[PDB]
Design a protein around this ligand. Sequence first.
Ligand code: CA
Ligand code: CA
Ligand code: CA
Length: 189
Amino acid sequence: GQQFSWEEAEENGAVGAADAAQLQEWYKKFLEECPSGTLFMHEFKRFFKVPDNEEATQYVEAMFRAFDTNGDNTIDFLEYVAALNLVLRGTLEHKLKWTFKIYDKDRNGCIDRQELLDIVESIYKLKKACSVEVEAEQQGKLLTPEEVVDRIFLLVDENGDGQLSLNEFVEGARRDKWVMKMLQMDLNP
Ligand SMILES: [Ca+2]
Ligand SMILES: [Ca+2]
Ligand SMILES: [Ca+2]
């Protein structure tokens, strides 16, 4: 399927512009020390944020999951790079789709309170092993791990159909009243 690189390289002998140039170095700096060197969920989390407590692995592990879905357990240079443009540089609304996918842990085309508790739960383990404990209790009235889920579901939804489709979430994630800040997690810093 597809190829071993971008369509540009396939046709064009060396593409052009400072575009590929930037990638030429990336593709080389990574494959230079290893011909046909592919990345792995482990080599990624490491060569990227190489954390320590590891706890902050659930979050990243998700990234590779939502992005690396080909089903080969491996992620070639191409895939990775694609993610960058989707995050590194300015990110357009295209995020509404990719993010909606991050939650899709069961792969079915529909999101359910099951996926909500899954991802959020992950975001919790992250902010937990971070530089703060946000002492759930004394900190602004804590809640149950299932509460937040029922909060993002009800708000994003409204018909009570019992199913959170893309369009439903997309529009419910385009602005809402708090879905962004939360689901966003990073925000900017
Ligand atoms: Ca892959
Ligand atoms: Ca799903
Ligand atoms: Ca619905």
